[PDB]
Structures are given as structure tokens and as C-alpha cells.
Amino acid sequence: KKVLTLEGDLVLGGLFPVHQKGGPAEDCGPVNEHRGIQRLEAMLFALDRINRDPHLLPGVRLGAHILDSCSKDTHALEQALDFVRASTAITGVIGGSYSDVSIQVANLLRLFQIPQISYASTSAKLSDKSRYDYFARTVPPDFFQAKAMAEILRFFNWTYVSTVASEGDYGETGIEAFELEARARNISVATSEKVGRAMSRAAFEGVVRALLQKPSARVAVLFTRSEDARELLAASQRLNASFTWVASDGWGALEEVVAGSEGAAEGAITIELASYPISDFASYFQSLDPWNNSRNPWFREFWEQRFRCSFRRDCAAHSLRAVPFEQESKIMFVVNAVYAMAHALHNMHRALCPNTTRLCDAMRPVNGRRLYKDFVLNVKFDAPFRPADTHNEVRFDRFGDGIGRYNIFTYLRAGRYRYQKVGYWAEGLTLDTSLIPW
Amino acid sequence: KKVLTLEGDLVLGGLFPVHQKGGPAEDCGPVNEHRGIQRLEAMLFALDRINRDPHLLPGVRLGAHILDSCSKDTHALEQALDFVRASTAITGVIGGSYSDVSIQVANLLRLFQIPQISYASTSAKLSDKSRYDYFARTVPPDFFQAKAMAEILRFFNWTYVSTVASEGDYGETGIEAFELEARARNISVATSEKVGRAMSRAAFEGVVRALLQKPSARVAVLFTRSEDARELLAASQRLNASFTWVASDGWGALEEVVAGSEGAAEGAITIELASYPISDFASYFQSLDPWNNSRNPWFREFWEQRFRCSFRQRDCAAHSLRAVPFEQESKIMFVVNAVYAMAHALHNMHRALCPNTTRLCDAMRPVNGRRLYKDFVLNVKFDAPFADTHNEVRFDRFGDGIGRYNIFTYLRAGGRYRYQKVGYWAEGLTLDTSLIPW
Numbered sequence: 107k108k109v110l111t112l113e114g115d116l117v118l119g120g121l122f123p124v125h126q127k128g129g130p131a132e133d134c135g136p137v138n139e140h141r142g143i144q145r146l147e148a149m150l151f152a153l154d155r156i157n158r159d160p161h162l163l164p165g166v167r168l169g170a171h172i173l174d175s176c177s178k179d180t181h182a183l184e185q186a187l188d189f190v191r192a193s194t195a196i197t198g199v200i201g202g203s204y205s206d207v208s209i210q211v212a213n214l215l216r217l218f219q220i221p222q223i224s225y226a227s228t229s230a231k232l233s234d235k236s237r238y239d240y241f242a243r244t245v246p247p248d249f250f251q252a253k254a255m256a257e258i259l260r261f262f263n264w265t266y267v268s269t270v271a272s273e274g275d276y277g278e279t280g281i282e283a284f285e286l287e288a289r290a291r292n293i294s295v296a297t298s299e300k301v302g303r304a305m306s307r308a309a310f311e312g313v314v315r316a317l318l319q320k321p322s323a324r325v326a327v328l329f330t331r332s333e334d335a336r337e338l339l340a341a342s343q344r345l346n347a348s349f350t351w352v353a354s355d356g357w358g359a360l361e362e363v364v365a366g367s368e369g370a371a372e373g374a375i376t377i378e379l380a381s382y383p384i385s386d387f388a389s390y391f392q393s394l395d396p397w398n399n400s401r402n403p404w405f406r407e408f409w410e411q412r413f414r415c416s417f418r419r420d421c422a423a424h425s426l427r428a429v430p431f432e433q434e435s436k437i438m439f440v441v442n443a444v445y446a447m448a449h450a451l452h453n454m455h456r457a458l459c460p461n462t463t464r465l466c467d468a469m470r471p472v473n474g475r476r477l478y479k480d481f482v483l484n485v486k487f488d489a490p491f492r493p494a495d496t497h498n499e500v501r502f503d504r505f506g507d508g509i510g511r512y513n514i515f516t517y518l519r520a521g522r523y524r525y526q527k528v529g530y531w532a533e534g535l536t537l538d539t540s541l542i543p544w
Numbered sequence: 545k546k547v548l549t550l551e552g553d554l555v556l557g558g559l560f561p562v563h564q565k566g567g568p569a570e571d572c573g574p575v576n577e578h579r580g581i582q583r584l585e586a587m588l589f590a591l592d593r594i595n596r597d598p599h600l601l602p603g604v605r606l607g608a609h610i611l612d613s614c615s616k617d618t619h620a621l622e623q624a625l626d627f628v629r630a631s632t633a634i635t636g637v638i639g640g641s642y643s644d645v646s647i648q649v650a651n652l653l654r655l656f657q658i659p660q661i662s663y664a665s666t667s668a669k670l671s672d673k674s675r676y677d678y679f680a681r682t683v684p685p686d687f688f689q690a691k692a693m694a695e696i697l698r699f700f701n702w703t704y705v706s707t708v709a710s711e712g713d714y715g716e717t718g719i720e721a722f723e724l725e726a727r728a729r730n731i732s733v734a735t736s737e738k739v740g741r742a743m744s745r746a747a748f749e750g751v752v753r754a755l756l757q758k759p760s761a762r763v764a765v766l767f768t769r770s771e772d773a774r775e776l777l778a779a780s781q782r783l784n785a786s787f788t789w790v791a792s793d794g795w796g797a798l799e800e801v802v803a804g805s806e807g808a809a810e811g812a813i814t815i816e817l818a819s820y821p822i823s824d825f826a827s828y829f830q831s832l833d834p835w836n837n838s839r840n841p842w843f844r845e846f847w848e849q850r851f852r853c854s855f856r857q858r859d860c861a862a863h864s865l866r867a868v869p870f871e872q873e874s875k876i877m878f879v880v881n882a883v884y885a886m887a888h889a890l891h892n893m894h895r896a897l898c899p900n901t902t903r904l905c906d907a908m909r910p911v912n913g914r915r916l917y918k919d920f921v922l923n924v925k926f927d928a929p930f931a932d933t934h935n936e937v938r939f940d941r942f943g944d945g946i947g948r949y950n951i952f953t954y955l956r957a958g959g960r961y962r963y964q965k966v967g968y969w970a971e972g973l974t975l976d977t978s979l980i981p982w
């Protein structure tokens with residue numbers, strides 16, 4: 107229903123799982139605090155900074171037309187019609203998160219030559235430029251995540267494993283790639299399970315029971331969406347079932363996956379893409395207020411849900427400074443996707459509009475084929491808001507993908523349950539066995 | 545670039561793979577004589593009959609707007625925008641052939657609530673009405689075909705087999721369903737191979753080689769697209785490899801698959817949806833003439849290919865479709881039935897919305913797609929044109945057809961090679977050891 111509109115000379119599209127998947131009839135569910143709100147706000151932060159930047163499109167304002175995917179490819183695609191209907195023109199799209207969402211959206215935007223930059227979609231299917239010719243991403247393909255996951259097993263001599271894959275382009279392509287890597291290291295698969303789009307608590311229990319039918323396969327490798335990783339952990343908890351979980355970025359370092367199921371989750375090894383916190387973001391975010399942030403139509407809902415109050419009194423009294431703030435793992439890539447589009451446009455403007463700083467005729471409208479092929483693919487700049495002791499640059503390969511760098515974690519009970527970095531993967535596995543309590 | 549347009553009070557969209565997929569350079573390849581031209585002609589034959597049927601839309605003429613998918617979902621989608629650009633009006637769409645084409649097209653037509661009836665897409669994925677809520681088919685899902693294939697292996701006691709699947713929604717979903725059915729019948733897979741969308745002749749040879757590495761498994765189960773089955777057989781020929789093929793409807797009883805590779809194909813068991821010849825279609829098709837077939841934009845191109853002639857060279861008139869042999873394409877019955885299904889739906893809607901006239905009343909200008917699909921398309925029940933007994937045209941709760949398959953064996957007699965109907969599957973396997981020569 108709602109849309110976040112911000113005005114400008116060039117309008118950037120945006121797609122975020124602001125809401126979780128709806129019920130059996132509802133299309134949209136509850137607010138996604140981390141991968142929704144924080145991620146969307148990060149696009150707003152980035153845009154704000156680009157529009158105050160004398161070196162980045164100094165005479166061209168970048169607007170936004172941001173949509174909620176509701177963590178659902180079908181909802182996202184009905185919403186995405188807004189990007190293509192003027193065929194107010196959309197110059198390029200930032201998103202989405204889920205691969206199923208970015209794939210559906212890419213099939214649509216290529217028809218209208220609209221460049222797309224995802225900040226979290228890691229499915230390897232997206233590397234195919236015969237199919238997704240207008241898509242690029244600031245994250246790498248799962249090509250590399252799979253290989254890392256297999257090297258992790260091979261390191262601890264975990265040679266008889268089970269797999270759980272969410273149905274679709276992320277889960278299915280993720281685990282297949284994992285299996286080929288595992289075979290090559292003499293790792294055999296006991297059983298392979300799939301998780302449907304619509305599964306009951308009972309259905310999930312049946313998956314856990316299916317994994318328990320192979321008592322020798324204590325290690326379970328997941329290439330699952332967050333919600334499926336959550337639901338599977340919750341079923342393990344309800345059945346006092348014990349597995350050593352090795353999981354992909356879907357689960358990653360999210361506290362909402364493990365909440366309520368800490369016991370079942372304890373001892374898990376998870377992977378998240380390597381990133382850094384961006385100070386200026388935490389300041390921007392924690393300073394948001396429901397009276398000052400009206401441009402975000404989903405902020406009021408988040409505020410009510412976070413503080414368990416209603417404006418319809420004293421809800422306004424709360425502060426995001428008063429509460430603990432943990433920055434989402436992929437915030438970096440959100441900010442980098444927007445800057446990649448902004449630098450692409452600025453470079454296009456430098457080549458096409460030399461006599462002015464305003465949008466010339468050559469950019470009324472912007473040719474998407476030229477934009478993607480000649481400028482988006484060719485950006486190369488220092489990551490903005492990166493810490494002074496870090497040397498990250500934003501660029502894409504020939505196929506529009508980012509560079510394969512991951513962090514590796516363990517979920518342990520310290521007596522709070524926390525995520526602990528125990529290593530990394532960067533064209534080879536590195537891990538400190540001292541940090542893992544087994 | 546071309547489109548078949550016919551005038552009517554109501555315009556039915558069409559989607560056929562008139563061309564094969566392009567090469568490394570091109571988008572479209574050579575003409576598809578059987579599953580392209582013949583299937584398309586069957587829609588035209590069907591529209592003509594309905595347009596002179598005194599008991600089926602006697603006052604509403606059905607026109608057409610037929611498109612070439614080029615055996616490729618990206619191309620098909622670029623073409624399918626023609627169907628949705630009204631927001632001339634397209635009432636419903638007939639097609640496509642390939643599952644990947646039908647799925648993508650459905651992902652678009654649902655957004656504009658356009659009913660779609662496929663005559664050949666068998667992917668079990670298309671049974672999901674939470675995703676493909678405007679899709680129906682005159683064919684059953686591959687859930688039944690995979691069961692039939694597994695049952696054949698079981699009967700002949702073929703415990704150790706290999707699998708070859710095509711990349712996509714047909715190959716991948718179908719072979720995963722056979723894999724389920726093989727497990728449950730104590731049948732084990734030696735190796736699972738996958739064929740890509742753009743493989744080469746040397747790459748096809750490597751799949752054959754990968755299969756040969758496991759010499760205990762001489763039986764290869766295929767869930768492949770015709771072009772892949774053709775290419776894979778050619779490589780088995782070239783490398784003098786010997787396998788017992790068990791193929792799905794993709795191969796079916798197509799002579800183009802086995803042409804020039806007959807030796808490598810001997811003994812092969814194939815599945816194909818049970819269908820009957822339509823003599824009137826045969827006569828009609830054989831009567832077609834480069835000079836009387838102006839309404840089909842691709843027919844002059846089909847003639848030059850089929851008869852290796854050229855209209856510029858004035859050497860095409862010499863040939864006839866009457867002087868050459870005529871094998872009806874196995875799924876012609878489902879093309880006709882799909883067209884009629886939509887006609888009956890529109891007729892039934894007319895009875896309800898225009899009671900005082902045979903002409904299109906205002907209550908059906910425009911036709912409401914939601915109502916057409918939900919209240920009329922899913923509810924049709926009529927005897928299939930061309931025995932009025934109890935073999936009818938109707939859709940199940942998931943908008944699918946009835947699981948009836950003929951089983952064939954490729955053999956030689958009195959070179960010369962043929963497909964021999966050695967059995968069937970219609971709620972259980974019913975083959976015959978007498979007709980199989982081994």
C-alpha cells in the first residue's frame with residue numbers, strides 16, 4: 107500500500123523487506139527491524155549525504171521511490187510495477203534483499219532497461235548476464251560462500267553431514283554448489299531436506315525428525331532464509347533435538363533467528379559477509395524520532411513495535427539513543443549500492459553533460475543500457491564512511507558481482523548468548539580453534 | 545520481431561516456440577517445424593472451427609495475437625509485454641510450450657490478471673495457485689510422469705541408474721520428483737548430470753564421459769528439453785557410447801531428437817502424454833500453401849527451411865505438404881483443447897453476463913480476468929472436440945489436466961527405425977513384455 111517518495115532530478119528506486127511475510131491470507135506480516143527498517147534508513151542516510159556532496163552530482167538531486175517487498179517475490183513484483191509504469195521515470199533500482207525478489211524484479215526491469223543494484227542478493231543465478239543483463243550487486247556470489255562452508259567442514263573432519271535448503275534460487279543453488287565442493291573433499295551427505303514457502307510448525311518438526319533418522323549425521327548444513335532458519339531452530343527446541351549447525355548468511359549473525367531457541371542454536375557456526383560499522387549511520391539512526399522522521403511511512407509502525415507503545419500517549423518520550431543499537435551486517439552494502447549508482451550517474455554526467463552541472467539533453471532521459479554497460483560496471487571508488495584503518499573499494503567484475511569476503515561466527519553462551527567471530531574466508535579459510543568452545 | 549494478428553470481438557493471445565533458441569550470437573535460431581509451426585497452426589485451425597461453430601460464441605468472433613517465444617523465456621517475456629500494454633485488449637493467453645517460458649509469462653500476466661492456458665507446460669511448480677493464480681493447463685503435472693518413469697525402472701529391475709536433467713523448471717523439478725520416486729522403489733542413482741541453457745557439442749561429450757565413469761549404470765533417465773536430448777544422443781553417437789535411455793515427454797516420440805543418432809537411441813523407453821490424431825487437422829495442415837497462408841508471418845520462412853528452397857530463386861512452388869509424409873505432433877490435441885477451454889469459458893461467461901443477446905454486451909466490455917479465470921475457466925466441462933463419451937476437458941483444483949501417458953520403445957524392424965507403443969500409465973503402469981524386444 108504505502109510508498110516512500112522523495113523528490114529529485116533523477117529518482118532512484120528502492121526495495122526492502124520492510125515487513126516480514128504475511129499470514130495465510132495477509133500479504134504483509136510484522137515489521138522487520140534489522141533487515142527492513144535499518145536497511146531502508148541506510149538508503150535514506152546515503153541519499154542525504156550524496157545530496158550534500160559537492161563532489162557527487164553537485165547540481166543533480168537524487169530522489170527515491172522506495173517499496174516494501176514484504177519478504178515475498180509476488181508482493182515485490184506487484185509493487186515493482188511502480189518502477190516501470192512511466193513507460194515519474196526511475197533511473198535505477200537499489201535492491202532487493204531476498205534473491206527470489208531480486209530475480210523477479212530483474213526479469214521485469216530488463217524489459218525497460220533499468221539498471222539494478224542489490225545490496226544482499228547472493229544467489230549465483232544472478233551472475234548470468236544472458237538472463238540478468240541489467241543487474242549488479244555489491245555482495246558476492248554464493249559460489250564462494252558454498253566453498254567456504256565446505257572448507258569449514260573439511261577442517262573439523264565433518265565428513266558425514268545433512269543439508270537443509272530453503273526452496274528457491276538462494277537455498278537450492280546455494281546447497282547444490284555446497285554439495286559439489288563437499289564431494290571434492292570426500293564429505294558425504296546423509297540426507298537433504300527442502301523447506302517450502304508455506305510450512306507449518308508440524309511440517310518443520312517433520313524435517314527435524316527426518317534429520318534425526320540419520321543419528322550419525324549430527325552436523326546440519328543450512329542454506330536457508332532467516333525465517334526458515336528460525337522455524338527450524340524453534341522446532342529443534344520443541345523436540346529437544348541436537349545438531350551442530352553450519353549455516354549461510356540467511357541466518358548469519360541475526361539475533362531474531364536464535365531468540366527463543368538459544369539452547370537448540372548453541373554451538374552453531376554461521377557466515378556473514380565481512381563488513382564494518384559506519385559511525386555516521388549509528389548517529390543518524392539513533393537520532394531518528396517519530397516526529398522528525400515522517401518521510402519514512404513505516405517508521406511509526408516500527409516505533410510502536412520497538413517500544414511496545416502507541417501514539418493514540420507517551421510513545422514520543424522514547425529514544426533510540428536510550429536503547430542498545432546493533433548495526434545490521436549488510437548496512438555497508440546498502441550505502442555502497444547507492445554510492446555505486448550515484449558515482450555511475452556522476453561519471454555519466456561528466457562524459458555526456460560537460461557544459462553544465464544540471465541534467466543535459468543527453469540525460470533527459472538517462473539511457474539505462476549506456477548507464478549500466480558503460481558506467482555502473484566501471485565505477486571504482488573508496489567505500490564512503492569506511493573506518494580510517496580500512497581500505498575497501500567499491501567495484502564490480504565483468505558480471506556485476508562484488509568480492510568474496512566473509513566472517514565466520516559461533517553462537518555461544520558467554521551468561522548471555524552471543525555471536526563470536528572465530529575466523530574469515532578470503533580466497534582461503536582462516537580460523538582460530540581457540541575461540542570455539544569445542 | 546514478427547506477430548500473427550487476426551481480428552475479432554475478443555482477442556486471444558498466443559505463445560509458441562516458432563523458433564529454436566539462438567546461437568552464441570543470435571536470439572532466435574532455426575524454425576521449429578513440429579512443436580512450433582504445427583502447434584501454432586493447430587491454434588488457427590481451432591479458432592477457425594470455433595468461429596464457424598453455431599453452438600459456441602455464435603455472435604462473438606475470436607481473433608488472435610500470436611507471439612514467438614524463440615524457445616527462450618527472456619525473449620518470450622519481451623514479446624509478452626504486447627499482452628499487457630493495454631494498461632488492443634487481450635482476453636486470455638494460450639501457451640507457452642516450455643515450463644520456464646510459461647512460468648515467467650505467468651509471473652507477468654498475473655499482475656494484469658490475464659488468464660493463461662498452457663497446452664504443453666508440465667512443471668509441477670505450475671500447480672501452486674498461491675504463485676500462479678491465473679494459470680491453467682490442458683496437461684497434467686510431471687508429478688505423474690516421474691512416478692510412471694520410476695515404475696518402469698522397478699518393473700525391469702533397474703536398481704542402478706544415472707540421471708540427466710535440463711537446467712530449468714522442467715528438468716530440475718521433474719528429476720528431483722523422479723529421484724523421490726526412485727528412493728521409494730529401492731532404485732539408486734549412480735550420477736546426476738545437469739545440462740545448461742547454452743552448452744556446446746564438446747561440453748555435451750563431457751556429460752557422456754561423466755556418465756561412462758560409472759559403467760555399472762548403463763541406464764540413463766532423462767528429464768530433458770528436446771534440444772538437449774537431441775544433442776546428448778549425438779555425443780553418445782560420436783563417442784560410440786551405449787546407454788539404455790528412459791526419457792520424459794521432452795524427448796517423447798519426436799523424430800528430430802533421434803534423427804541421425806538412431807543407433808545410439810536403440811532400445812530407449814520414452815514417455816508422452818496420451819493423445820489422438822485429428823484427421824481434420826491433418827487435412828488442413830497438408831493443405832497449407834506459401835501463397836494462401838499470408839495470415840501466418842513465419843510460414844514462408846518455414847517453407848524455405850522445410851523444402852531447402854528460396855522464394856527469391858523461384859524454386860519453392862515445386863513442393864507440397866500433400867506430397868510429403870505427415871506425422872501429427874503429439875500435443876496438437878492439447879493446443880485445440882486449450883483454445884476451446886477458453887472459448888467455452890467465454891461462452892459460459894456470455895450466457896451469464898449477456899442473457900438477451902448473442903453479441904458482446906456492455907457487461908463484458910472489458911472482460912474481467914479474475915472472474916473469467918476463477919468463475920469460468922476453472923469450471924469448464926465439455927467433451928473434447930474430435931468422442932462425446934466421458935473423456936472431457938476440465939481442470940482439477942490446481943487447474944491441471946488428467947495424468948494419462950503412452951509408453952514407447954525405440955526399435956528397428958525390416959534400419960528402419962520406429963517408436964513402438966509398448967504400454968501406458970493411467971493411474972498405474974500397464975506395459976507389455978511382448979512388444980519390447982529385450
Ligand SMILES: *[C@@H]1O[C@H](CO)[C@@H](O)[C@H](O)[C@H]1NC(C)=O
Nearest residue numbers: 259260261262263264539544
Ligand atoms: C583432521 O584430521 C587430520 C588428519 O587425521 C588431523 O591432522 C587434524 O588435526 C584433524 N582436525 C581436527 C580439527 O580435528
Ligand SMILES: *[C@@H]1O[C@H](CO)[C@@H](O)[C@H](O)[C@H]1NC(C)=O
Nearest residue numbers: 342343344345346347348369
Ligand atoms: C534432551 O536430550 C538429552 C540427550 O538425549 C537428554 O540427556 C536430556 O535429558 C533431554 N531432556 C529432555 C527434557 O528430554
Ligand SMILES: *[C@@H]1O[C@H](CO)[C@@H](O)[C@H](O)[C@H]1NC(C)=O
Nearest residue numbers: 697698699700701702977982
Ligand atoms: C524382477 O524381479 C522379480 C523378482 O526377482 C521377478 O519376479 C520379475 O520377473 C523381474 N522382472 C523382469 C522384467 O525380469
Ligand SMILES: *[C@@H]1O[C@H](CO)[C@@H](O)[C@H](O)[C@H]1NC(C)=O
Nearest residue numbers: 780781782783784785786807
Ligand atoms: C562401438 O563399440 C562397439 C562395442 O565396443 C563395437 O562393436 C563397435 O565396432 C564400435 N564402433 C566403433 C566405430 O568404434
Ligand SMILES: N[C@@H](CCC(=O)O)C(=O)O
Nearest residue numbers: 203204205226227228229
Ligand atoms: N543473501 C540472501 C539474503 C539474506 C540477507 O537479506 O541478508 C539472498 O540472496 O536471498
Ligand SMILES: N[C@@H](CCC(=O)O)C(=O)O
Nearest residue numbers: 641642643664665666714
Ligand atoms: N513438458 C515440456 C514441454 C515439451 C513439449 O513442448 O512437448 C515442458 O513443460 O517444458
Ligand SMILES: [Cl-]
Nearest residue numbers: 175202203204
Ligand atoms: Cl527483499
Ligand SMILES: [Cl-]
Nearest residue numbers: 613640641642
Ligand atoms: Cl514456448
Ligand code: NA
Nearest residue numbers: 156157159163
Ligand atoms: Na550533491
Ligand code: NA
Nearest residue numbers: 594595600601
Ligand atoms: Na463461434
